[PDB]
Design a protein around this ligand. Structure first.
Ligand SMILES: Cc1cn([C@H]2C[C@H](O)[C@@H](COP(=O)(O)OP(=O)(O)OP(=O)(O)O)O2)c(=O)[nH]c1=O
Ligand SMILES: [Ca+2]
Ligand SMILES: [Ca+2]
Ligand SMILES: [Ca+2]
Ligand SMILES: [Ca+2]
Ligand SMILES: [Ca+2]
Ligand SMILES: [Ca+2]
Ligand code: NA
Ligand code: NA
Ligand code: NA
Length: 902
DNA sequence: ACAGGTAAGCAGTCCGCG
DNA sequence: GCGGACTGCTTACC
């Protein structure tokens, strides 16, 4: 097989690499890499190398990387550009691996670990590591085993070995319900003293050193705590054994009081799953505890336990260890579903960067753009500094608040990247400029044609229509990657719906879940089968379908992020190729395109419909349009429509056969107008929304920009079995909204769009009535806690002090002294509840770390002093008053002029 | 340092108000 | 007292 790298580091004049050799084994080598840089030179000295702008350059080879470094400063001290890849690590990879990398993931050692640290004080700061490490569960992907290290003797209590048969038993049987599929994979190792455990762990690590190291929060707690614990005991040179090269870096960020550290283990790629989750999951959770996340992702128990975690070890060491093993498996289960590690490897090896670099799109693209240029024997420009500076983005139509029974939406495929490709925007494809007319003249096709020669943007830029650009080239490649995965995804979604309608005719029997590749649309033979299967087999398929979908989603939504981030990069001063001319060429062309098609779509429906001057496009954002379909339906009337499914099928057909064709002609013209390289402005139907036939449901409404809700029946060709709401911007979608309120608000909306005014009213009267019975946590608000101290002003709120921040301050006063209660971590999120006039806390509200139930010290008090009336008005009614006001309804039946009969 | 702009809602502060 | 203009903060849509 082809050789591929594992980890790479630059240490002095040496580049340490861990790789998998031609045979398939893991090796490690030191290399005094001879790097190269470039200097513009006289054309009289023709050569093989030229920068991206065609100017000739000379290559200088250095005896070692340090000389190449000093040469960069010298050129800087002279005032001349020093071209080429300045991060030698990348150069080394681009050099060592002159080809597309095909890697064997079963060869990459992926380790997952978690540690437990009992602590009487409070959260045991890893900068200190003053408490003993009493448990480590480490899973190795090549061994496929969980290596458990248990400390039986500690100054906080001595316990008996952990029982694997007790652990395996069910909760209901006094066991731990440790997943059966991993019981035979556990390797238990009890230790009599902490030193032996740590020492046995280090040797373990040397034999099976991780290439990729992950876990939940391992970077902020596990890794650091282990480093300083082993360091504060066996000495610092021992602590450095965690690095296959014996070199570590400690980054100190002593945020105000208390000190937090970040340890860098050279020769190792650390992918904290929490960071992988926040970047690739596309979610915004009120809490980020593995417990909360596992629940959200896997829908499993809450790992229940009696006393406080600080005493879990002594009273029930049996469960303590079982819970540590599970937390490790939990992250693994999430990964099998989300597949963020696979994504990371894919990207890392595609770009040829250290794997952990996938957290940085700028470095990811610099590597890509760099390699792609090295091929053509070109020299990348030197990174220059630029001052931060604002620039226009997308256009967003101001919508008319109101309801909208029938609405049809259209969007553009990979907009900004497409625009980049169509216009050929790239650092070296610039041709010049042109006197620009007001953007609205291009929108209205009044302005003279920009260029007859070049590709243009309404922002004034011109690019070559012939020559191709690195940016358009490399971005298109990942776009195709994005396209393949979205196809697999929508297919799996289309299958999920086929199974759902099936779960209506579950022909009783004991059957087998079919053998199918859910990425492809179900064949006719299978569709014919399913219909007979039962809930047993059917449901297993639905689960497998949805797992396949999520998998594709991950792969596609993230290739999207990456390409969209290349556009972003262009507007960020640290990007080697930063340039507001292109960034703006992009966004400006974007604004034109949307408003251009807005005009078209309007002209086309004021004609082949009738009424002229009417505005069909009611809303729009960046690259989308929501076309009111009322008239399209009126044209034919409800008559011919047998059922809901009919007009929906009618609209689909109309959008695909009529709408789009016109729209395609609309952008084909705009393309000529700008004389762009290649037409790539593809706008397809998105949603088909309306209320179920003959119902009082308004089926759709808006309150303003970025705040609407539609009753959708088809989304990009997926015809749901049951109508699915599409809500955006409203409180039901915000993580700051109490769980109970989101559920309630969404239901009020469901009723609004689907059933009617009185349906909405009924539910409102009921929710209000039982509201006070809700669970305190389900109705608490959530917010992040930044700059807690800025307004700390002595335990009491300072000027302009934010509400939630005020809540915190009050909390620290109710636990003031009790250094045993949970603290609020700067940056983390917190639950927030209002307090009625007069309370021992003495303030408007109180706030505590999210995902956790406030400690028993305060709980029963805040539970009493809670202010449901404020919670109900601020969180539920106010927002609701906004939805119905825009919908032109009332959640509460207003007294009528007829309230004198009854 | 380490993708980007656009934009809504809440809550605090200051000010004009018989 | 108390709405309204403006700002700081948070969070969602593209
Ligand atoms: C979601 C998102 C969009 N955008 C911009 C660039 C997008 O091309 C533009 C339109 O957004 P979207 O419509 O969300 O996405 P898209 O056009 O890139 O892709 P598709 O619809 O095919 O899934 O908004 C960002 O810059 N960053 C983001 O994170
Ligand atoms: Ca833990
Ligand atoms: Ca869109
Ligand atoms: Ca789009
Ligand atoms: Ca054209
Ligand atoms: Ca189309
Ligand atoms: Ca689409
Ligand atoms: Na159970
Ligand atoms: Na059936
Ligand atoms: Na007309």
């Amino acid at each position: 097989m082809k050789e591929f790298y594992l980890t790479v580091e630059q240490i002095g004049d040496s580049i340490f690499e861990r790789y998998i050799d031609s045979n398939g084994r893991e090796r490690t080598r030191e290399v005094e890499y001879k790097p190269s840089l470039f200097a513009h030179c006289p054309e009289s000295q023709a050569t093989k190398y030229f920068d991206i702008y065609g100017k000739p350059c000379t290559r200088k080879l250095f005896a070692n990387m340090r000389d190449a470094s000093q040469w960069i400063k010298r050129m800087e001290d002279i005032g001349l550009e020093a071209l080429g890849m300045d991060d030698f690590k990348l150069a080394y990879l681009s050099d060592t691996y002159n080809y597309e990398i095909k890697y064997d993931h079963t060869k990459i050692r992926v380790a997952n670990f978690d540690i437990e640290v009992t602590s009487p004080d409070g959260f045991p700061e890893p900068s200190q590591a003053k408490h003993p490490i009493d448990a480590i569960t480490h899973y190795d992907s090549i061994d496929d085993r969980f290596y458990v290290f248990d400390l039986l003797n500690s100054p906080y209590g001595n316990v008996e070995e952990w029982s694997i048969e007790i652990a395996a038993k069910l909760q209901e049987q006094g066991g731990d319900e440790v997943p059966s599929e991993i019981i035979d994979k556990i390797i238990y190792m009890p230790f009599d003293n902490e030193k032996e455990l740590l020492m046995e762990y280090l040797n373990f690590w040397q034999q099976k050193t991780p290439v990729i190291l992950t876990g939940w929060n391992v970077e902020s707690f596990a890794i650091p705590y282990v480093y300083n614990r082993i360091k504060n005991i066996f000495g610092e040179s021992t602590a450095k054994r965690l690095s296959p090269h014996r070199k570590t870096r400690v980054k100190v960020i002593e945020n105000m009081y208390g000190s937090r550290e970040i340890i860098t283990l050279f020769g190792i790629s650390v992918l904290d799953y929490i960071d992988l989750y926040k970047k690739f999951s596309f979610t915004n959770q009120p809490s980020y505890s593995l417990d909360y996340i596992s629940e959200f992702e896997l829908n499993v128990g809450k790992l229940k336990y009696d006393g406080p975690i600080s005493k879990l070890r002594e009273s029930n060491h049996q469960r303590y260890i079982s819970y540590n093993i599970i937390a490790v498996y939990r992250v693994l289960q999430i990964d099998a579903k989300r597949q963020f590690i696979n994504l990371s490897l894919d990207m890392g090896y595609y770009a040829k960067i250290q794997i952990q670099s996938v957290f940085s799109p700028i470095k990811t693209w610099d590597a890509i753009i760099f390699n792609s240029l090295k091929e053509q024997n070109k020299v990348i420009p030197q990174g220059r500094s630029h001052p931060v500076q604002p620039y226009p983005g997308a256009f967003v139509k101001e919508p008319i608040p109101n309801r909208y029974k029938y609405v049809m939406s259209f969007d553009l495929t990979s907009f900004y990247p497409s625009i980049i490709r169509q216009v050929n925007i790239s650092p070296e494809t610039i041709a010049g400029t042109f006197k620009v007319a007001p953007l609205h003249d291009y929108i209205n096709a009044v302005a003279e044609r920009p260029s007859d020669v070049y590709s243009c943007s309404p922002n004034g830029m011109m690019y070559y229509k012939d020559r191709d650009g690195v940016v358009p080239t490399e971005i298109t490649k990942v776009f195709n990657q994005r396209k393949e995965h979205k196809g697999y995804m929508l297919a799996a979604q289309r299958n999920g719906e086929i199974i759902k309608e099936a779960l209506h005719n579950p022909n009783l029997s004991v059957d087998e879940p079919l053998d199918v590749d859910y990425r492809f649309d179900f064949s006719d033979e299978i569709k014919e089968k399913i219909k007979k299967l039962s809930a047993k087999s059917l449901n297993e398929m639905l689960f497998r379908a949805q797992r396949t979908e999520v998998a594709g989603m991950t792969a596609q939504i993230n290739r999207k992020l990456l390409i969209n981030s290349l556009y972003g990069a262009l507007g960020n001063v640290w990007f080697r190729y930063y340039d507001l001319r292109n960034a703006t060429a992009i966004t400006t062309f974007g604004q034109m395109a949307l408003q251009w098609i807005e005009r078209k779509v309007n002209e086309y429906l004021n004609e082949v419909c009738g009424t002229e001057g009417e505005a069909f496009v009611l809303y729009g954002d960046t690259d989308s349009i929501y076309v009111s379909a009322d008239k399209i339906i009126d044209k034919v009337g409800e008559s011919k429509f047998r059922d809901t499914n009919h007009w929906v099928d009618f609209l689909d057909k109309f959008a695909r056969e009529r709408m789009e064709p016109a729209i395609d002609r609309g952008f084909r013209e705009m393309c000529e107008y700008m004389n762009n390289k290649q037409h790539l402005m593809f706008m397809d139907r998105e949603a088909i929304a309306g209320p179920p036939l003959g119902s009082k449901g308004i089926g759709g409404f808006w309150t303003g920009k970025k705040r609407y809700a539609l009753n959708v029946w088809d989304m990009e060709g997926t015809r749901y079995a049951e109508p699915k709401l599409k809500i955006m911007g409203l409180e039901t979608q915000k993580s700051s909204t109490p769980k109970a309120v989101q559920k309630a608000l969404k239901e009020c909306i469901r009723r609004m769009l689907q059933e009617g005014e009185e349906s909405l009213q009924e539910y409102f009267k009921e929710f209000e009535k039982e509201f006070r019975q809700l669970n305190y946590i389900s109705i608490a608000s959530v917010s992040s806690a930044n700059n807690i101290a800025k307004y700390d002003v002595g335990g009491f709120p300072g000027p302009k002090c934010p509400f939630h921040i005020r809540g915190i301050l009050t909390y620290n006063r109710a636990i003031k002294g009790n250094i045993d209660a949970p603290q609020v971590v700067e940056g983390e999120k917190v639950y927030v509840l209002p307090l009625r006039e007069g309370n021992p806390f003495g303030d408007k509200c109180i706030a505590w770390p999210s995902g956790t139930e406030i400690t028993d010290l305060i709980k029963d008090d805040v539970l009493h002093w809670m202010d449901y009336t404020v919670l109900l008005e601020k969180t539920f009614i106010k927002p609701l008053e906004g939805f119905t006001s825009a919908a032109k309804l009332d959640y509460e039946k207003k007294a009528s002029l007829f309230d004198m009969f009854d």
